[PDB]
Amino acid sequence: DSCIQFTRHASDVLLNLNRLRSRDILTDVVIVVSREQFRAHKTVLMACSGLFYSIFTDQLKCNLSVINLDPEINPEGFCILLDFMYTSRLNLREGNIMAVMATAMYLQMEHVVDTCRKFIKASE
Amino acid sequence: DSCIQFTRHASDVLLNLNRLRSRDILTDVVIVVSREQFRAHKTVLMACSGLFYSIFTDQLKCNLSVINLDPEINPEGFCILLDFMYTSRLNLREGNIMAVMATAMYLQMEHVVDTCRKFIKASE
């Protein structure tokens, strides 16, 4: 087509979605991790994660207001990944990299799994 | 902080939100314009428009599944702006610029109003 494009539009949209999350506006699901609860927007979770995409496209699960993750999932790893979904920023540290990579593999967040693998390989 | 950032994350999120819109997945509102109906995600509309932000933060209107726009709003102008919200791409043409600018002013989409004003000023 002959469209023009606003470079900062996608980043501005994500920033606003994160502001709605902060203020708990229109959040429609609670993700339960080892008795730690995280409120979010189903659409943002689906847009970021192959696991949430599969969950919320399921005819029965699409209607659930609570999703319980596997007990092996670490709440801090989940929290770091949820922050990444809403900001593009990943708080990757020596002390959390193993939990973050394991959580990203479970959530099916391929780009995060890729940078964790590379950061681990550099330290060996 | 000491975060790393994935450059394409925001664009990839918006692309996936547009794929959900295309497939009518988790859309939670119908916008009615001069008897033309547009399905969308309330959160994306709020993230893009000052008008939708004000509508869906209202304690009564946040729960509506149908929103009727002012009868002066042109459905084509709305359609072009809805496409912009989900893609960052604006199909601005000599034949639609007046309707697009009027719709962007009503929706409170300041960056769109700005480029329309500039494109109109260049033609005078």
Partner: peptide
């Protein structure tokens, strides 16, 4: 704004 840019030409994509």
């Amino acid at each position: 704004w840019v030409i994509p």
